[PDB]
Amino acid sequence: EVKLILYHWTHSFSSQKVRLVIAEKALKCEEHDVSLPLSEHNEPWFMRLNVPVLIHGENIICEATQIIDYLEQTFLDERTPRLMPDKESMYYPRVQHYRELLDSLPMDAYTHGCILHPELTVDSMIPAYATTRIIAKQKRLKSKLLDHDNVKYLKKILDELEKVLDQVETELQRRNEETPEEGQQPWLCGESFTLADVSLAVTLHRLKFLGFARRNWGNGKRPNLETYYERVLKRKTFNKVLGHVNNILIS
Amino acid sequence: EVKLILYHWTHSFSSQKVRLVIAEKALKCEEHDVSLPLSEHNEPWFMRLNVPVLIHGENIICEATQIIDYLEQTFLDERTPRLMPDKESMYYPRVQHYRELLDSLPMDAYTHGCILHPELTVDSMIPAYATTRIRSNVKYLKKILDELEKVLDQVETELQRRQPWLCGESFTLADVSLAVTLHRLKFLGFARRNWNGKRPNLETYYERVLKRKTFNKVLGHVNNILIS
Protein backbone atom coordinates (compact mmCIF):
# COMPACT_ATOMS: atom_id res chain seq x y z
CA GLU A 1 0.00 0.00 0.00
CA VAL A 2 0.94 3.67 -0.35
CA LYS A 3 2.59 4.29 3.02
CA LEU A 4 1.27 6.93 5.41
CA ILE A 5 4.14 8.78 7.12
CA LEU A 6 3.68 11.31 9.93
CA TYR A 7 6.29 13.45 11.68
CA HIS A 8 5.01 15.03 14.87
CA TRP A 9 5.64 15.99 18.49
CA THR A 10 3.89 13.50 20.79
CA HIS A 11 2.91 16.21 23.28
CA SER A 12 1.97 19.04 20.90
CA PHE A 13 -1.69 20.04 20.80
CA SER A 14 -1.87 19.79 17.00
CA SER A 15 -0.17 16.38 16.93
CA GLN A 16 -2.73 15.01 19.38
CA LYS A 17 -5.63 15.89 17.08
CA VAL A 18 -3.96 14.29 14.05
CA ARG A 19 -3.03 11.05 15.81
CA LEU A 20 -6.54 10.81 17.24
CA VAL A 21 -8.08 11.22 13.78
CA ILE A 22 -5.78 8.53 12.37
CA ALA A 23 -7.05 6.26 15.14
CA GLU A 24 -10.73 7.16 14.69
CA LYS A 25 -10.39 6.30 10.98
CA ALA A 26 -8.47 3.04 11.62
CA LEU A 27 -5.69 4.14 9.25
CA LYS A 28 -2.26 2.51 9.31
CA CYS A 29 0.43 5.17 9.76
CA GLU A 30 4.19 5.09 10.30
CA GLU A 31 4.32 7.74 13.03
CA HIS A 32 7.65 9.33 13.96
CA ASP A 33 7.89 11.22 17.26
CA VAL A 34 10.84 13.51 16.56
CA SER A 35 10.74 14.91 20.10
CA LEU A 36 13.62 13.94 22.42
CA PRO A 37 13.34 12.88 26.07
CA LEU A 38 15.96 15.45 27.13
CA SER A 39 16.73 18.68 25.30
CA GLU A 40 20.12 20.28 24.71
CA HIS A 41 19.49 22.05 28.04
CA ASN A 42 18.35 18.74 29.61
CA GLU A 43 14.67 19.63 30.01
CA PRO A 44 11.64 17.32 29.76
CA TRP A 45 8.71 17.82 27.40
CA PHE A 46 6.50 19.71 29.86
CA MET A 47 9.08 22.53 29.91
CA ARG A 48 9.07 23.09 26.15
CA LEU A 49 5.52 24.15 25.20
CA ASN A 50 6.07 26.57 22.31
CA VAL A 51 3.92 22.03 12.76
CA PRO A 52 3.32 18.35 11.97
CA VAL A 53 3.65 16.98 8.44
CA LEU A 54 2.11 14.02 6.60
CA ILE A 55 3.61 12.27 3.56
CA HIS A 56 1.19 10.04 1.63
CA GLY A 57 2.63 9.01 -1.71
CA GLU A 58 3.04 12.13 -3.83
CA ASN A 59 1.34 14.43 -1.28
CA ILE A 60 3.01 16.44 1.48
CA ILE A 61 0.63 18.22 3.87
CA CYS A 62 1.68 20.47 6.76
CA GLU A 63 -0.38 21.86 9.66
CA ALA A 64 -3.00 19.82 11.52
CA THR A 65 -6.20 21.27 10.06
CA GLN A 66 -4.88 20.63 6.55
CA ILE A 67 -3.71 17.10 7.39
CA ILE A 68 -7.09 16.13 8.82
CA ASP A 69 -8.92 17.65 5.86
CA TYR A 70 -6.63 15.57 3.65
CA LEU A 71 -7.35 12.36 5.58
CA GLU A 72 -11.13 12.83 5.47
CA GLN A 73 -10.92 13.46 1.71
CA THR A 74 -8.60 10.69 0.47
CA PHE A 75 -9.40 7.64 2.65
CA LEU A 76 -12.93 6.74 1.51
CA ASP A 77 -12.99 2.95 1.90
CA GLU A 78 -16.42 1.75 3.01
CA ARG A 79 -14.84 0.34 6.18
CA THR A 80 -13.12 3.66 6.98
CA PRO A 81 -15.24 5.80 9.35
CA ARG A 82 -16.17 9.31 8.23
CA LEU A 83 -15.61 12.00 10.86
CA MET A 84 -17.67 14.56 8.90
CA PRO A 85 -21.19 14.21 7.46
CA ASP A 86 -21.83 14.65 3.76
CA LYS A 87 -21.72 18.29 2.68
CA GLU A 88 -25.41 18.16 1.66
CA SER A 89 -26.53 16.90 5.09
CA MET A 90 -28.62 18.58 7.77
CA TYR A 91 -25.71 18.10 10.17
CA TYR A 92 -22.76 19.48 8.19
CA PRO A 93 -23.30 23.18 9.07
CA ARG A 94 -23.48 22.27 12.76
CA VAL A 95 -20.38 20.07 12.82
CA GLN A 96 -18.29 22.52 10.79
CA HIS A 97 -19.52 25.37 13.00
CA TYR A 98 -18.29 23.83 16.25
CA ARG A 99 -15.12 22.49 14.62
CA GLU A 100 -14.17 26.01 13.53
CA LEU A 101 -15.26 27.48 16.87
CA LEU A 102 -12.90 25.18 18.79
CA ASP A 103 -10.02 25.24 16.30
CA SER A 104 -10.09 29.05 16.63
CA LEU A 105 -9.12 29.02 20.31
CA PRO A 106 -5.63 30.39 21.17
CA MET A 107 -4.26 27.29 22.85
CA ASP A 108 -0.65 28.46 22.53
CA ALA A 109 -1.62 31.59 24.46
CA TYR A 110 -3.36 29.55 27.17
CA THR A 111 -0.22 27.47 27.73
CA HIS A 112 2.12 30.46 27.60
CA GLY A 113 -0.20 32.23 30.04
CA CYS A 114 -0.21 29.20 32.35
CA ILE A 115 3.57 29.00 32.72
CA LEU A 116 3.53 32.74 33.21
CA HIS A 117 0.91 34.00 35.67
CA PRO A 118 0.06 30.57 37.15
CA GLU A 119 -2.07 32.39 39.75
CA LEU A 120 -4.93 32.21 37.22
CA THR A 121 -4.79 28.39 37.04
CA VAL A 122 -6.12 25.83 39.51
CA ASP A 123 -4.48 22.42 40.00
CA SER A 124 -2.15 23.06 37.08
CA MET A 125 -0.31 19.86 36.18
CA ILE A 126 2.89 21.72 35.20
CA PRO A 127 5.44 21.92 38.05
CA ALA A 128 5.72 25.33 39.69
CA TYR A 129 9.46 25.52 38.94
CA ALA A 130 8.57 25.87 35.25
CA THR A 131 7.30 29.34 36.13
CA THR A 132 10.37 30.39 38.13
CA ARG A 133 12.82 29.85 35.26
CA ILE A 134 10.62 31.48 32.60
CA ILE A 135 18.93 54.26 37.96
CA ALA A 136 17.64 51.25 35.99
CA LYS A 137 14.11 52.26 37.03
CA GLN A 138 13.34 52.67 33.32
CA LYS A 139 13.29 48.87 33.07
CA ARG A 140 11.58 48.40 36.44
CA LEU A 141 8.48 50.11 35.05
CA LYS A 142 9.07 48.80 31.52
CA SER A 143 8.59 45.19 32.60
CA LYS A 144 5.73 46.08 34.95
CA LEU A 145 3.82 47.46 31.96
CA LEU A 146 4.39 44.36 29.82
CA ASP A 147 3.11 42.24 32.71
CA HIS A 148 0.04 44.46 33.09
CA ASP A 149 -0.74 44.17 29.37
CA ASN A 150 0.00 40.43 29.26
CA VAL A 151 -2.49 39.79 32.07
CA LYS A 152 -5.16 42.06 30.58
CA TYR A 153 -4.79 39.97 27.41
CA LEU A 154 -4.80 36.59 29.18
CA LYS A 155 -7.88 37.45 31.24
CA LYS A 156 -9.57 38.59 28.02
CA ILE A 157 -9.11 35.33 26.10
CA LEU A 158 -10.07 33.33 29.20
CA ASP A 159 -13.38 35.22 29.18
CA GLU A 160 -13.72 34.41 25.48
CA LEU A 161 -13.06 30.75 26.29
CA GLU A 162 -15.95 30.73 28.76
CA LYS A 163 -18.38 31.98 26.11
CA VAL A 164 -17.26 29.27 23.68
CA LEU A 165 -17.78 26.58 26.32
CA ASP A 166 -21.16 28.15 27.11
CA GLN A 167 -22.31 27.32 23.57
CA VAL A 168 -20.86 23.82 23.86
CA GLU A 169 -22.64 23.40 27.19
CA THR A 170 -25.91 24.57 25.65
CA GLU A 171 -25.37 22.31 22.63
CA LEU A 172 -24.66 19.31 24.85
CA GLN A 173 -27.79 20.16 26.85
CA ARG A 174 -29.82 19.90 23.63
CA ARG A 175 -28.43 16.38 23.16
CA ASN A 176 -29.24 15.41 26.75
CA GLU A 177 -32.82 16.58 26.22
CA GLU A 178 -33.16 14.60 22.97
CA THR A 179 -31.74 11.32 24.33
CA PRO A 180 -33.28 8.87 26.82
CA GLU A 181 -31.09 8.41 29.88
CA GLU A 182 -31.26 4.63 29.27
CA GLY A 183 -29.57 4.27 25.90
CA GLN A 184 -26.49 5.25 23.96
CA GLN A 185 -25.62 8.88 24.55
CA PRO A 186 -24.76 11.07 21.54
CA TRP A 187 -21.70 13.23 21.04
CA LEU A 188 -21.52 16.99 20.48
CA CYS A 189 -23.46 17.24 17.20
CA GLY A 190 -25.13 13.85 16.82
CA GLU A 191 -24.79 10.13 17.38
CA SER A 192 -21.50 10.03 15.45
CA PHE A 193 -18.04 11.01 16.68
CA THR A 194 -17.04 13.93 14.45
CA LEU A 195 -14.08 16.23 13.90
CA ALA A 196 -15.88 18.68 16.18
CA ASP A 197 -15.58 16.00 18.87
CA VAL A 198 -11.83 15.47 18.49
CA SER A 199 -11.27 19.23 18.64
CA LEU A 200 -13.38 19.39 21.81
CA ALA A 201 -11.90 16.34 23.53
CA VAL A 202 -8.28 17.33 22.90
CA THR A 203 -9.01 20.93 23.90
CA LEU A 204 -10.56 19.88 27.22
CA HIS A 205 -7.71 17.46 27.93
CA ARG A 206 -5.22 20.29 27.46
CA LEU A 207 -7.18 22.84 29.50
CA LYS A 208 -7.11 20.20 32.24
CA PHE A 209 -3.32 19.95 31.91
CA LEU A 210 -2.98 23.74 32.15
CA GLY A 211 -5.16 23.99 35.26
CA PHE A 212 -7.89 25.86 33.37
CA ALA A 213 -10.49 23.12 33.97
CA ARG A 214 -11.91 23.80 37.44
CA ARG A 215 -12.51 27.37 36.29
CA ASN A 216 -14.80 26.13 33.52
CA TRP A 217 -16.47 22.90 34.65
CA GLY A 218 -16.99 20.83 37.77
CA ASN A 219 -18.74 21.26 41.12
CA GLY A 220 -21.99 22.25 39.41
CA LYS A 221 -20.59 24.33 36.54
CA ARG A 222 -21.24 23.09 32.99
CA PRO A 223 -22.37 19.59 34.05
CA ASN A 224 -23.02 18.42 30.49
CA LEU A 225 -19.44 19.40 29.61
CA GLU A 226 -18.04 17.56 32.64
CA THR A 227 -20.00 14.46 31.65
CA TYR A 228 -18.72 14.75 28.07
CA TYR A 229 -15.11 14.90 29.30
CA GLU A 230 -15.26 11.99 31.75
CA ARG A 231 -16.83 10.01 28.90
CA VAL A 232 -14.21 10.67 26.22
CA LEU A 233 -11.51 9.75 28.74
CA LYS A 234 -13.01 6.24 28.67
CA ARG A 235 -13.23 6.11 24.86
CA LYS A 236 -10.96 3.30 23.68
CA THR A 237 -9.41 5.30 20.82
CA PHE A 238 -8.76 8.33 23.02
CA ASN A 239 -7.15 6.34 25.82
CA LYS A 240 -4.81 4.48 23.46
CA VAL A 241 -3.66 7.65 21.69
CA LEU A 242 -3.77 10.15 24.56
CA GLY A 243 -4.18 8.00 27.67
CA HIS A 244 -0.99 9.27 29.32
CA VAL A 245 -0.16 12.45 27.38
CA ASN A 246 -0.71 14.59 30.50
CA ASN A 247 1.47 12.37 32.75
CA ILE A 248 4.68 14.32 33.39
CA LEU A 249 6.21 11.12 34.81
CA ILE A 250 6.34 9.63 31.28
CA SER A 251 8.84 10.89 28.71
CA GLU B 1 24.30 11.41 14.38
CA VAL B 2 21.27 13.62 13.75
CA LYS B 3 19.87 12.91 10.28
CA LEU B 4 18.77 15.59 7.81
CA ILE B 5 15.66 14.53 5.88
CA LEU B 6 13.93 16.24 2.96
CA TYR B 7 10.68 15.26 1.25
CA HIS B 8 10.25 17.07 -2.03
CA TRP B 9 9.22 16.98 -5.67
CA THR B 10 12.30 16.93 -7.89
CA HIS B 11 10.82 19.21 -10.57
CA SER B 12 9.20 21.70 -8.17
CA PHE B 13 10.57 25.23 -8.44
CA SER B 14 10.80 25.65 -4.67
CA SER B 15 12.44 22.25 -4.17
CA GLN B 16 15.14 23.18 -6.69
CA LYS B 17 16.13 26.16 -4.54
CA VAL B 18 16.22 23.93 -1.44
CA ARG B 19 18.29 21.14 -3.00
CA LEU B 20 20.75 23.65 -4.46
CA VAL B 21 21.21 25.34 -1.07
CA ILE B 22 21.92 21.94 0.50
CA ALA B 23 24.58 21.21 -2.12
CA GLU B 24 26.09 24.70 -1.92
CA LYS B 25 26.52 24.19 1.84
CA ALA B 26 27.94 20.64 1.51
CA LEU B 27 25.35 19.08 3.83
CA LYS B 28 24.67 15.34 3.97
CA CYS B 29 20.91 15.06 3.39
CA GLU B 30 18.67 12.03 2.85
CA GLU B 31 16.47 13.36 0.05
CA HIS B 32 13.20 11.62 -0.86
CA ASP B 33 11.64 12.42 -4.23
CA VAL B 34 8.00 11.58 -3.49
CA SER B 35 6.89 12.37 -7.05
CA LEU B 36 6.11 9.53 -9.44
CA PRO B 37 6.94 9.38 -13.16
CA LEU B 38 3.34 8.77 -14.25
CA SER B 39 0.21 9.97 -12.47
CA GLU B 40 -3.02 8.06 -11.98
CA HIS B 41 -4.31 10.05 -14.98
CA ASN B 42 -1.22 8.97 -16.96
CA GLU B 43 0.56 12.33 -17.17
CA PRO B 44 4.35 12.97 -17.02
CA TRP B 45 5.94 15.45 -14.60
CA PHE B 46 5.83 18.33 -17.10
CA MET B 47 2.01 18.22 -17.08
CA ARG B 48 1.62 18.63 -13.32
CA LEU B 49 3.49 21.92 -12.81
CA ASN B 50 0.69 23.10 -10.49
CA VAL B 51 5.23 22.34 -0.27
CA PRO B 52 8.55 20.68 0.65
CA VAL B 53 9.46 19.76 4.21
CA LEU B 54 12.70 19.28 6.14
CA ILE B 55 13.01 17.12 9.26
CA HIS B 56 16.16 17.67 11.35
CA GLY B 57 16.22 16.07 14.78
CA GLU B 58 13.36 17.76 16.62
CA ASN B 59 12.65 20.34 13.89
CA ILE B 60 10.04 20.23 11.13
CA ILE B 61 10.17 23.09 8.60
CA CYS B 62 7.89 23.24 5.56
CA GLU B 63 7.89 26.08 3.03
CA ALA B 64 11.10 26.43 1.01
CA THR B 65 11.93 30.00 2.04
CA GLN B 66 11.73 28.76 5.65
CA ILE B 67 13.76 25.60 5.04
CA ILE B 68 16.58 27.71 3.59
CA ASP B 69 16.42 30.15 6.51
CA TYR B 70 16.60 27.26 8.98
CA LEU B 71 19.63 25.82 7.18
CA GLU B 72 21.46 29.15 7.21
CA GLN B 73 20.84 29.54 10.96
CA THR B 74 21.62 26.01 12.12
CA PHE B 75 24.77 24.72 10.40
CA LEU B 76 27.17 27.35 11.69
CA ASP B 77 30.25 25.10 11.62
CA GLU B 78 33.16 27.05 10.14
CA ARG B 79 33.50 24.48 7.34
CA THR B 80 29.91 25.14 6.20
CA PRO B 81 29.79 27.99 3.65
CA ARG B 82 27.42 30.85 4.45
CA LEU B 83 25.00 31.94 1.72
CA MET B 84 24.08 35.14 3.60
CA PRO B 85 26.12 37.92 5.26
CA ASP B 86 25.72 38.86 8.90
CA LYS B 87 22.39 40.47 9.76
CA GLU B 88 24.12 43.73 10.79
CA SER B 89 26.53 43.76 7.83
CA MET B 90 26.63 46.47 5.17
CA TYR B 91 25.83 43.90 2.46
CA TYR B 92 22.79 42.18 4.00
CA PRO B 93 20.13 44.85 3.20
CA ARG B 94 20.76 44.60 -0.55
CA VAL B 95 21.00 40.80 -0.84
CA GLN B 96 17.67 40.45 0.95
CA HIS B 97 16.09 42.89 -1.51
CA TYR B 98 17.00 40.97 -4.67
CA ARG B 99 16.22 37.72 -2.84
CA GLU B 100 12.75 38.96 -1.89
CA LEU B 101 12.17 40.51 -5.32
CA LEU B 102 13.13 37.28 -7.10
CA ASP B 103 11.24 35.08 -4.63
CA SER B 104 8.24 37.35 -5.32
CA LEU B 105 7.98 36.51 -9.03
CA PRO B 106 4.75 34.67 -10.04
CA MET B 107 6.42 31.52 -11.35
CA ASP B 108 3.09 29.69 -11.15
CA ALA B 109 1.46 32.23 -13.47
CA TYR B 110 4.35 32.03 -15.93
CA THR B 111 4.20 28.24 -16.21
CA HIS B 112 0.45 28.22 -16.84
CA GLY B 113 0.95 31.12 -19.24
CA CYS B 114 3.42 28.89 -21.10
CA ILE B 115 1.16 25.84 -21.39
CA LEU B 116 -1.72 28.10 -22.34
CA HIS B 117 -1.02 30.91 -24.81
CA PRO B 118 2.19 29.33 -26.17
CA GLU B 119 2.24 32.14 -28.76
CA LEU B 120 4.15 34.24 -26.21
CA THR B 121 6.72 31.45 -25.76
CA VAL B 122 9.86 30.95 -27.85
CA ASP B 123 11.55 27.53 -27.79
CA SER B 124 9.32 26.27 -25.00
CA MET B 125 10.61 22.90 -23.83
CA ILE B 126 7.10 21.72 -22.92
CA PRO B 127 5.58 19.60 -25.72
CA ALA B 128 2.85 21.29 -27.73
CA TYR B 129 0.30 18.60 -26.83
CA ALA B 130 0.18 20.04 -23.31
CA THR B 131 -1.50 23.16 -24.71
CA THR B 132 -4.03 21.00 -26.55
CA ARG B 133 -4.69 18.80 -23.50
CA ILE B 134 -5.03 21.60 -20.94
CA ARG B 135 -7.39 23.66 -23.11
CA SER B 136 -9.76 20.66 -22.87
CA ASN B 137 -6.22 35.46 -20.40
CA VAL B 138 -3.51 36.93 -22.61
CA LYS B 139 -4.24 40.34 -21.08
CA TYR B 140 -3.03 39.37 -17.60
CA LEU B 141 -0.20 37.27 -19.05
CA LYS B 142 1.41 40.07 -21.07
CA LYS B 143 1.04 42.19 -17.93
CA ILE B 144 3.07 39.96 -15.61
CA LEU B 145 5.59 39.35 -18.39
CA ASP B 146 6.12 43.10 -18.76
CA GLU B 147 6.41 43.32 -14.98
CA LEU B 148 9.16 40.72 -15.31
CA GLU B 149 10.93 42.93 -17.86
CA LYS B 150 11.09 45.60 -15.15
CA VAL B 151 12.39 43.20 -12.48
CA LEU B 152 15.06 41.82 -14.82
CA ASP B 153 16.03 45.41 -15.65
CA GLN B 154 17.15 45.82 -12.03
CA VAL B 155 19.18 42.60 -12.13
CA GLU B 156 20.99 43.57 -15.35
CA THR B 157 22.35 46.82 -13.92
CA GLU B 158 23.65 45.19 -10.73
CA LEU B 159 25.67 42.78 -12.89
CA GLN B 160 27.42 45.63 -14.72
CA ARG B 161 28.84 46.74 -11.35
CA ARG B 162 31.26 43.82 -10.97
CA GLN B 163 34.97 36.70 -11.02
CA PRO B 164 32.15 37.70 -8.64
CA TRP B 165 28.43 36.89 -8.55
CA LEU B 166 25.24 38.94 -8.43
CA CYS B 167 25.61 40.90 -5.18
CA GLY B 168 29.22 40.22 -4.25
CA GLU B 169 32.22 37.95 -4.48
CA SER B 170 30.57 34.94 -2.83
CA PHE B 171 27.69 32.79 -4.07
CA THR B 172 24.67 33.89 -2.02
CA LEU B 173 20.97 33.11 -1.71
CA ALA B 174 20.25 35.86 -4.23
CA ASP B 175 22.15 33.64 -6.69
CA VAL B 176 20.08 30.49 -6.17
CA SER B 177 16.84 32.46 -6.55
CA LEU B 178 18.22 34.03 -9.73
CA ALA B 179 19.81 30.85 -11.11
CA VAL B 180 16.81 28.60 -10.50
CA THR B 181 14.46 31.34 -11.73
CA LEU B 182 16.25 31.87 -15.05
CA HIS B 183 16.62 28.12 -15.57
CA ARG B 184 12.85 27.72 -15.28
CA LEU B 185 12.19 30.67 -17.60
CA LYS B 186 14.29 28.90 -20.25
CA PHE B 187 12.20 25.75 -19.75
CA LEU B 188 9.04 27.84 -20.18
CA GLY B 189 10.45 29.46 -23.33
CA PHE B 190 10.89 32.95 -21.85
CA ALA B 191 14.70 32.83 -22.23
CA ARG B 192 15.11 34.42 -25.67
CA ARG B 193 12.40 37.01 -24.99
CA ASN B 194 14.53 38.44 -22.16
CA TRP B 195 18.16 37.67 -23.06
CA ASN B 196 22.02 37.37 -28.29
CA GLY B 197 21.41 41.12 -28.53
CA LYS B 198 19.98 41.72 -25.05
CA ARG B 199 21.17 41.70 -21.41
CA PRO B 200 24.72 40.51 -22.17
CA ASN B 201 26.14 40.16 -18.65
CA LEU B 202 23.04 38.18 -17.66
CA GLU B 203 23.59 35.78 -20.56
CA THR B 204 27.11 35.38 -19.16
CA TYR B 205 25.73 34.95 -15.64
CA TYR B 206 23.29 32.24 -16.72
CA GLU B 207 25.87 30.47 -18.89
CA ARG B 208 28.40 30.55 -16.04
CA VAL B 209 26.27 28.85 -13.38
CA LEU B 210 25.45 26.07 -15.85
CA LYS B 211 29.13 25.07 -15.77
CA ARG B 212 29.20 25.27 -11.95
CA LYS B 213 30.01 21.91 -10.37
CA THR B 214 27.25 21.97 -7.75
CA PHE B 215 24.48 23.42 -9.93
CA ASN B 216 25.12 20.86 -12.67
CA LYS B 217 25.03 18.00 -10.16
CA VAL B 218 21.66 18.87 -8.63
CA LEU B 219 19.88 20.62 -11.53
CA GLY B 220 21.88 19.49 -14.55
CA HIS B 221 18.85 17.83 -16.14
CA VAL B 222 15.76 19.14 -14.38
CA ASN B 223 14.75 20.65 -17.76
CA ASN B 224 15.11 17.37 -19.69
CA ILE B 225 11.64 15.96 -20.34
CA LEU B 226 13.18 12.61 -21.32
CA ILE B 227 14.16 11.93 -17.68
CA SER B 228 11.54 11.17 -15.04
Residue numbers in the entry:
A (entry chain A): 23 to 72, 77 to 160, 186 to 302
B (entry chain B): 23 to 72, 77 to 162, 201 to 226, 236 to 268, 270 to 302
From the paper:
GDAP1, a 358-amino-acid mitochondrial outer membrane (MOM) protein regulating the mitochondrial network, is highly expressed in neurons and less in Schwann cells. GDAP1 functions in regulating the mitochondrial network by inducing fragmentation of mitochondria without inducing apoptosis.
We determined the crystal structure of the complete human GDAP1 core domain, which shows a novel mode of dimerization within the glutathione S-transferase (GST) family. The long GDAP1-specific insertion forms an extended helix and a flexible loop. Notably, the GDAP1-specific insertion (α-loop) was present in all constructs, in contrast to a recently reported mouse GDAP1 structure. The main differences constitute a missing α helix between β2 and β3 and the unique helices α5 and α6 with the connecting α5-α6 loop. Contrary to predictions, we show that GDAP1 lacks helix α2. On the other hand, the catalytic Tyr9 residue of GSTA1-1 is conserved as Tyr29 in GDAP1, but Tyr29 points in another direction and makes central contacts at the GDAP1 dimer interface.
